Structure formats: C-alpha cells, structure tokens
Amino acid sequence: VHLTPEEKSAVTALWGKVNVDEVGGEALGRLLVVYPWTQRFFESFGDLSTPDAVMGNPKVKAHGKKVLGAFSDGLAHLDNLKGTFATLSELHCDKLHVDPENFRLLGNVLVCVLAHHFGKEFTPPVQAAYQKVVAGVANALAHKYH
Amino acid sequence: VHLTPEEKSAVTALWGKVNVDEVGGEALGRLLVVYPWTQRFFESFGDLSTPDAVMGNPKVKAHGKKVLGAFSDGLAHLDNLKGTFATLSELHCDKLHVDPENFRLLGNVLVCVLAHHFGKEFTPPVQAAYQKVVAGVANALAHKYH
Amino acid sequence: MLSPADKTNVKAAWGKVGAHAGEYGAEALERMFLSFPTTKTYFPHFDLSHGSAQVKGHGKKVADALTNAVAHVDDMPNALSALSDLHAHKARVDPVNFKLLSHCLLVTLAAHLPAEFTPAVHASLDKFLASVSTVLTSKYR
Amino acid sequence: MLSPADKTNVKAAWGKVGAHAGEYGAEALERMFLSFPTTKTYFPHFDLSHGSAQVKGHGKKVADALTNAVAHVDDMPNALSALSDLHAHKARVDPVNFKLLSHCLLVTLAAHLPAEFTPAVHASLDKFLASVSTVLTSKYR
Ligand code: HEM
Ligand code: HEM
Ligand code: HEM
Ligand code: HEM
Numbered sequence: 390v391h392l393t394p395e396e397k398s399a400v401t402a403l404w405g406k407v408n409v410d411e412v413g414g415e416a417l418g419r420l421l422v423v424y425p426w427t428q429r430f431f432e433s434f435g436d437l438s439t440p441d442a443v444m445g446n447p448k449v450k451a452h453g454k455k456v457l458g459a460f461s462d463g464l465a466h467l468d469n470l471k472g473t474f475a476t477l478s479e480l481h482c483d484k485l486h487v488d489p490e491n492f493r494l495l496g497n498v499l500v501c502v503l504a505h506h507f508g509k510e511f512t513p514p515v516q517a518a519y520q521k522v523v524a525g526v527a528n529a530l531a532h533k534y535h
Numbered sequence: 536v537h538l539t540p541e542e543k544s545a546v547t548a549l550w551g552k553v554n555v556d557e558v559g560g561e562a563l564g565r566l567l568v569v570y571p572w573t574q575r576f577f578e579s580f581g582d583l584s585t586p587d588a589v590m591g592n593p594k595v596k597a598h599g600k601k602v603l604g605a606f607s608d609g610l611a612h613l614d615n616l617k618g619t620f621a622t623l624s625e626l627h628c629d630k631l632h633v634d635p636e637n638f639r640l641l642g643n644v645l646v647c648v649l650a651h652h653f654g655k656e657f658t659p660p661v662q663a664a665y666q667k668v669v670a671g672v673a674n675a676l677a678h679k680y681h
Numbered sequence: 682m683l684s685p686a687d688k689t690n691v692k693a694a695w696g697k698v699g700a701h702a703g704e705y706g707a708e709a710l711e712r713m714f715l716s717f718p719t720t721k722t723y724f725p726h727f728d729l730s731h732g733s734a735q736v737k738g739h740g741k742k743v744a745d746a747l748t749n750a751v752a753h754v755d756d757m758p759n760a761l762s763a764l765s766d767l768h769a770h771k772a773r774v775d776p777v778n779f780k781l782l783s784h785c786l787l788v789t790l791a792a793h794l795p796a797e798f799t800p801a802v803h804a805s806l807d808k809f810l811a812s813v814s815t816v817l818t819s820k821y822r
Numbered sequence: 823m824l825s826p827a828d829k830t831n832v833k834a835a836w837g838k839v840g841a842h843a844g845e846y847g848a849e850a851l852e853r854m855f856l857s858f859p860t861t862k863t864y865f866p867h868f869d870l871s872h873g874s875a876q877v878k879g880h881g882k883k884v885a886d887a888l889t890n891a892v893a894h895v896d897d898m899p900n901a902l903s904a905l906s907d908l909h910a911h912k913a914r915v916d917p918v919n920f921k922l923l924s925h926c927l928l929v930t931l932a933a934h935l936p937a938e939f940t941p942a943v944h945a946s947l948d949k950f951l952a953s954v955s956t957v958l959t960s961k962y963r
Contacts, residue, residue, distance in 0.1 A: 422941045423948050425822050426773035440942040486722040490775045497925055504932040505939055513849070516929060517856040534719055568800045569807050571963050572914040586800045632863045636916045643784060647803065650791035657792050659708070663715040680860055682960075808963060819823070822949060 390467050390525040396518040397467065403507065403515060404464055412502055413457030414450035418443045420491075420498045427491055456495075463526055470529035478533035489531035496523030536613060536671040542664040543613065549653065549661060550610055555603045558652070562645045563599030564590040570640050576633060602641075609672050616675035624679035635677035642669025683808060688754050690805030694790065694797045695751045702748055705789050707740025712785040720778055747786075750813050761816045769820035776818050783810035824946075824953060829895045831946035835931065836892045838938050843889060846930050848881025853926040861922055864915055884923075891954055898957050910961035917959045924951035 392400065421428050421443045428437050434448040443449055459477060466473040481487045500519055504511045538546070567574050567589045574583050580594040589595055605623060612619040627633045646665055650657045683691070698705060713720050714729055727735045746764055753760035768774055787806060791798045824832070839846060854861050855870055855877075868876040887905060894901030909915060928947060932939045 419941050419944055423822075423945045426769075426775065429773040440940070440945070444941055482722070486725045488722045488775050488778070489719050490777050500925075501928050501932050501944065504929045505936060508933050508936060511929075511933055513853045513856045516853050520857040531719070534722075565800050565803060569804045572910075572916065575914040586804075590800055628863070632866045634863045634916050634919070635860050636918050646784075647787055647791045647798075650788045651795060651798055654792050654795065657788075659712045659715045662712055662788060666716040677860070680863075804963070822945070 390470065390521055392467060392518060392521060396521065399515050399518045400464065400467075400522055403503070403510065403519075404461070406507075407461075407503075409457045409461055410454050412499075412506065413453035413455070413460075415444075415453070415505075416495060416499045416502045417453035417456060418446075418449050419502065420495050421449065423498065424494050427494065430485065430487060460499075460526060463529075464522070467522070467525075470525050471532055474526070474529040475533060478530050481530060482534045489527065489534060492527035492530045493523075496527050499523055536616070536667050538613065538664060538667055542667065545661050546610065546613075546664050546668055549649070549656070550607070552653070553649075555607050556600050558645075558648055559599035559601070559603030560590075560596035561599070561651075562641060562648045563602060564592075564595050565648065566641050566644045567595065569644065573637060573640065576631065576637075606672060609675070610668070613668070613671075616671050617678050620672070620675040621679060624676050627676060628680045635673065635680060638673035638676045639670075642673050645669060683754065683805075683812060686801075687805040687808055690802045691751060691754065691809045694794060694802050694806060695748070697794055697797050698744075698748075698790070701793070702744035703737075703741040705740075705786075705793060706742070706744030706747070707737050709782065709785045709789045710736050710740050710743070712788055713782055716785065717778075717781045720781055723772070723774055723778070743782075747813065750809075750816075757812065757816055758819070761813070765817055765820050768817045773821075776814075776821070779814035779818060783807070783814060786810055824895065824949060827942075828946040828949055831943045832892055832895060832950045835935065835938055835943050835947060836889065838935055839885075839931070842934070843885035844878075844882035846881075846927075846934065847883070847885030847888075848878050850923065850926040850930045851877055851881050851884070853929060854923050857926065858919075858922045861919055864913070864919070888927075888954070892950075895950075898953060899960070902954070902957050906958055906961050909958050914962075917955075917962070920951075920955035920959060924948070924955060927951060 421431065421437055422440050431437065431449070431452070434446055434452070436442040436446065437449075459474075463470055463473050481489075500516060500523060503519060504516070567577070567583055568586050577583065577595070577598075580592060580598075582588040582592065583595075609616060609619055617624075627635075646662065646669060649665060650662070695702075711731070721729060724739075727733065727739070729736065746761070749760055750757050758765075787803070787810070790806065791803075836843075852872065855865075862870060868874065868880070870877065887902070890901055891898055899906075928944070928951070931947065932944075
C-alpha cells in the first residue's frame with residue numbers, strides 16, 4: 390500500500406490466524422452498535438434494537454462474513470487495492486448509496502476487534518500497519534464515487 | 536490532481552485575476568481569526584489580540600504573501616505537486632512542526648476568500664475545481680511527514 | 682458557545698440574507714453536491730440536475746430552519762429539537778457531512794455579501810453553523 | 823450525553839483499569855505516535871522513543887485526568903475546567919487529534935480487558951471519550 394516489507398509480513402501473518410467468520414460478524418455488529426446511524430442500510434435485517442439483538446442477528450453475522458471475505462481477498466492485492474475494489478466501489482456508490490465515511494468507521498471498528506482478539510500480539514507497530522491497510526481499503530472503495 | 540482539462544482552465548483563468556499579495560494577507564489573517572488556535576505558530580508576530588490587530592499586522596501580511604507565493608508556483612506544476620512541495624513539506628514537519636490539518640483549514644479559508652472577492656464569478660463548478668486543488672496542495676504538503 | 686458579539690454578527694449578516702435565504706440555501710446545496718459528491722448518497726431520490734425543483738425546495742427548507750435558529754439564538758436546542766430528532770432517527774446523516782454543508786453555506790454568503798462578510802462576521806458565522814450542526818447531531822447516540 | 827447505563831459501563835470498565843491506567847496511558851500515546859505520525863507535531867520537545875520516560879510520565883498524566891473525569895462523570899465541564907483552559911489557550915491542539923487519541927485508547931483497553939470490552943461497553947467508552955473531547959475543546963473560540 391505503502392507497506393514496508395516488514396509491515397507487509399506483520400499484516401500477512403496475523404491475518405493467517407484470523408477466523409473471518411467470527412471477526413466479520415463482530416466488526417459489523419459492533420459498528421451497528423457504536424455508531425447506531427449505520428443501521429440505516431440494514432432495515433431489512435430485523436431487530437437491531439439492542440446490542441444483544443444486533444450481535445445475535447444472523448443476517449448481520451452473515452453480512453459481516455461477506456464483508457471480511459472481500460476484505461480478506463484484498464490483502465492479496467495490497468499493491469492494487471484500487472483495481473481490486475473498482476467494481477465494489479461502483480456498486481457501493483451507484484447501487485447501495487453508502488457514504489464512504491462508513492468505510493472508515495468499519496476500518497476503525499475492525500482494528501478494535503483485532504486488538505480485542507489478539508491482545509498482546511496486537512502491538513503498536515502491528516496496529517500501525519493495520520491502520521495503513523484499513524485506510525488504504527477505505528480509499529480504494531471510495532475511489533469510483535462520483 | 537484529478538482535474539479535468541476544463542477544470543484546469545477554469546482554475547487558471549480565475550487565478551490570473553488574483554492579487555497574490557492581497558489574497559495572501561487576507562487568507563492568512565482570516566485563518567488566525569476564524570481558528571484562533573492556529574495562532575500557536577506566530578507568537579513572534581506580535582499583537583493578534585483582535586481581528587484588526589491580525590488583519591493589519593505587517594508580519595501577517597508579509598507571511599501571507601510568502602505562503603500564497605509558494606502556492607501560486609504550485610499552480611504551474613499541478614502535475615507534480617508532491618515534487619514541487621517536497622522541500623517545503625520537509626520543512627513544515629521537521630523544522631516548523633506544523634500539524635497538516637492547518638493546511639486543510641487554510642485551503643478552506645482561501646476558498647471563502649476567492650468567493651468573497653469574485654462573487655458570482657466563483658461558480659459552483661469553479662469552486663469544485665478549487666476544492667480539488669487546495670486538497671492536492673494540502674496532501675502534497677503533508678506527504679513528507681513522518 | 683456564541684458570545685453577544687457573535688449573536689449580533691449573525692443576526693446582522695442573516696438580516697441581510699433576508700428574502701434570499703431560499704435561493705442561498707439552494708446554492709449551498711448545489712455547491713456541496715459538486716465539491717463533495719459523496720454527499721449525494723443521501724439524496725438518491727432527488728433530481729440533482731441544475732435547477733432541480735427538488736433542490737430548490739430543499740434549499741428553502743434548510744434556509745427556513747437556519748432562519749428559525751437565528752430567531753431563537755438564545756434557545757436553539759429547543760427551537761431545533763424536532764430537526765435534531767429527525768436527523769438522529771430517520772435521515773441518519775453521518776456527522777462529517779454537516780461540516781461540508783456549513784462550509785458551502787459560508788462560501789455562498791461570502792459570494793453574496795461582500796460588504797458584510799468581514800473577518801469578524803466570518804468567524805461568528807462559522808461558530809454559528811458549528812453550533813447548529815452540534816444540535817442536529819446531539820441525539821445520534 | 824451519557825446515559826445512566828453509559829456512566830455505569832464506563833465506571834465498571836475503568837474500575838478494572840486500576841493500577842494500570844498510567845501504563846495504558848503510555849501505551850495509547852505510543853500507539854497514537856506510530857499510527858498517526860502527524861500527532862508527533864505537538865511533542866517536538868519529547869523523546870518519542872519506545873519507553874521514553876517523557877512518554878511514560880505523560881501517559882500517567884492523561885490517565886489520571888481520565889480517572890478524574892469518570893469520578894465526575896456527572897460534572898465533567900467543571901471537573902476539567904483547568905484542562906479545557908490549558909488546551910484552548912496554551913497547547914492549542916487541533917480538534918481532529920482528539921479522535922485519534924480516543925481511538926488509540928479504545929484499542930488499548932480492548933487489548934487489555936477482553937472480557938470487559940463488550941459491544942455495549944465499547945459504545946459507552948467511545949461516547950465518553952467523545953464527551954471528554956468536547957469538553958477539552960469547548961473554549962477554543
Ligand atoms: C471493508 C469494507 C467493505 C467491503 C469490502 C464491502 C463489501 C461488500 C460486499 C462484497 C457486498 C456484497 C453485495 C454484492 O456483491 O452484491 C456488500 C454489500 C453491501 N454493503 Fe458493503 N462492504 C464494505 C463496507 C460496508 C459498510 C461499512 C456498509 C454500511 C455500514 C456497507 C453496506 C453494504 C450494504 C447495505 C450492502 C448490500 C447487502 C445486501 O444486498 O443485503 N458496506 N459489501
Ligand atoms: C498553502 C499552504 C502553505 C504554503 C505553500 C506555505 C509556504 C511557506 C513558505 C514558503 C514559508 C517560508 C519558508 C522558509 O522560512 O524557508 C513558510 C513558513 C512558515 N509556514 Fe508555511 N505555508 C503554508 C501553510 C502554512 C500554515 C497553514 C501554517 C500554520 C497554520 C504555516 C506555518 C508556517 C510557519 C510558522 C512558517 C515560518 C514563519 C517564520 O518565518 O517564522 N504554513 N510557509
Ligand atoms: C445545519 C445543516 C442542516 C440543516 C439546517 C438541515 C435541515 C433540514 C430540514 C429543514 C429538512 C427537511 C425536513 C422536513 O421534511 O420537514 C432536512 C431534511 C434532510 N436533510 Fe438535513 N439539514 C442539515 C444538514 C444536512 C446534511 C449535511 C445532510 C446530508 C448531506 C442532510 C440530509 C438531509 C436529507 C437526506 C433530508 C431529507 C430530504 C427529503 O427527502 O425531502 N441534512 N434537513
Ligand atoms: C483524551 C483527551 C486528552 C486528555 C484527557 C489530555 C490531558 C492532558 C493532561 C492531563 C496534560 C498535562 C497537564 C499538565 O502538565 O499539568 C496534557 C498536556 C498536553 N496535551 Fe493533552 N490530553 C488529551 C488530548 C490531547 C491530544 C489529542 C493531544 C495532541 C495530539 C494533546 C497534547 C498535549 C500536549 C502537547 C501537552 C503538553 C505536554 C508537555 O509539554 O508535557 N492532548 N493533556
């Protein structure tokens with residue numbers, strides 16, 4: 390991205406230990422809870438009335454896994470997040486009407502979840518590298534907005 | 536920047552009408568007045584206690600001219616802002632310790648100044664081109680921070 | 682918080698806006714759409730074409746609300762309660778967008794009120810738009 | 823505005839921090855300096871190297887103030903008056919930076935209080951830091 394070989398390794402290696410299923414469901418649920426206004430795009434999901442109700446909602450969990458999935462696949466194209474998310478970028482703009490700021494909120498939520506999960510392992514230098522990736526991904530996703 | 540040719544012409548046409556000496560002083564003065572926190576960098580400039588003190592301070596006026604001078608040069612190398620601004624970026628970071636957010640504030644202030652001065656000539660779309668430009672300069676100026 | 686000075690400044694500049702508030706509201710919207718295109722994601726249901734009646738209609742609504750905040754400068758939280766509720770519960774506009782509108786509102790005024798748009802008035806107006814924004818976003822979570 | 827649940831959530835979470843608050847203060851700063859290198863512009867006079875006593879000491883200071891704020895969750899404006907002064911008139915840190923330190927503080931708590939960092943607590947702490955930020959930047963202009 391602007392990732393140092395060292396920073397590249399750090400990202401790469403931690404990720405390999407990530408359960409996308411769980412992390413994706415948690416990142417997305419936390420987002421809906423911490424920043425309630427993001428719920429505006431998930432009306433059809435159901436009961437998001439409570440933390441408990443969000444975290445439990447399977448429509449939420451499954452959406453989380455799909456999001457982290459695509460995110461996960463993007464880490465394989467760290468040299469071209471732009472080309473990797475071009476179509477996803479147009480979709481979010483043109484079909485979903487998702488404000489790119491949301492990409493930023495999730496990124497940050499994602500980082501809190503990783504810290505939550507890896508405690509010790511998620512060091513300042515490892516956070517720094519992840520911060521550059523979430524920023525990078527959000528930028529790529531926002532790229533085709535017009 | 537992501538400036539269409541017609542955006543680049545519009546930037547250039549208007550900029551031809553600007554009195555960099557005057558706009559420089561106005562933009563810098565207004566910045567110290569609207570966001571008083573920005574005054575932290577100019578305690579050697581003297582009296583900045585009131586709007587009149589700021590707007591009329593010979594030091595603020597002179598500095599503003601210097602800043603817009605550097606900016607005008609930037610407008611002739613719109614293709615290589617990072618290049619153009621590299622030594623300045625290094626200076627602001629390493630010597631001056633100026634938080635890059637200052638560069639975005641100034642960009643916004645400058646856009647209001649252009650609006651102020653050109654009235655109706657500062658059309659919605661001319662503003663959109665200048666927005667792209669001030670953002671590019673701000674980014675260029677922050678590129679060497681570390 | 683707004684000082685007595687600020688209040689005088691705002692009533693004065695807004696006073697001049699007068700019967701043009703509507704048109705200025707509309708213009709501010711258009712400038713925002715062109716400069717910060719991401720803001721369009723909130724108006725998927727609008728004709729955002731140049732001279733859209735929708736935009737025109739929307740501009741008046743925003744202007745009327747601002748006019749209402751000036752009229753109740755000593756009780757904005759209450760004068761704007763309803764709109765605070767709407768934005769928090771239905772529209773759910775992300776906070777950062779408020780600063781984009783504010784900015785475009787400042788540009789429009791500057792472009793229309795050269796004589797009143799002094800440094801001091803500029804500052805007062807900025808603090809004002811920030812306050813309105815804070816209110817509209819106060820019930821978000 | 824912090825709800826009763828929020829205040830509770832916060833007091834619980836911070837309760838657990840205990841004797842480690844200073845350490846967490848320090849770690850958050852360290853994470854901030856590395857993740858958002860622009861924040862270093864306000865500490866030219868510090869040794870920003872890992873485990874620097876200046877950073878350590880500053881970490882303590884920040885933690886203690888946070889503590890004081892939890893204790894006066896009800897009277898923040900008043901409990902942090904002096905601090906709002908200092909930041910507004912002396913330090914003059916740009917407001918964008920408060921969000922960066924806040925985030926780094928969450929990350930730190932997450933990493934150290936796994937069991938206690940539930941979604942509901944995560945939400946409360948965020949709102950809390952937002953409130954603290956608001957207070958610390960309220961006298962800027
Ligand atoms: C890491 C950033 C993100 C990635 C990689 C991503 C990716 C995806 C993918 C792969 C889909 C599947 C839909 C399809 O392919 O037809 C999707 C749908 C969607 N995303 Fe995003 N997304 C991201 C962030 C967000 C955020 C933050 C929000 C809102 C808070 C959001 C809102 C939506 C919505 C509303 C849909 C449609 C789901 C449906 O059809 O029910 N996305 N996204
Ligand atoms: C458009 C963005 C800017 C440009 C092109 C610019 C350009 C310049 C130039 C050419 C100099 C003199 C260099 C030298 O001394 O060798 C300078 C100095 C300086 N600039 Fe920037 N500047 C910009 C924005 C800012 C902002 C927004 C601030 C603070 C809020 C700032 C703070 C300073 C300070 C404190 C100095 C040194 C003054 C002194 O001589 O004591 N600059 N700038
Ligand atoms: C201080 C600034 C703002 C003011 C005074 C304001 C005021 C209003 C008012 C008066 C309405 C109409 C409510 C009604 O139907 O009675 C409205 C609706 C709306 N606003 Fe806000 N607003 C502001 C900021 C924003 C921002 C920044 C955005 C997004 C970029 C936004 C998005 C919307 C949307 C999408 C609607 C609904 C429009 C419709 O479907 O008719 N607002 N606002
Ligand atoms: C979470 C919100 C914050 C709190 C509670 C806080 C609290 C404090 C405290 C307790 C002090 C020391 C006062 C003393 O020495 O008596 C301080 C000083 C300082 N703070 Fe803030 N702070 C916060 C956010 C920030 C941020 C985000 C920055 C910059 C990125 C910052 C920059 C500074 C600086 C530069 C000093 C002076 C350090 C020195 O010279 O020793 N603060 N702050």
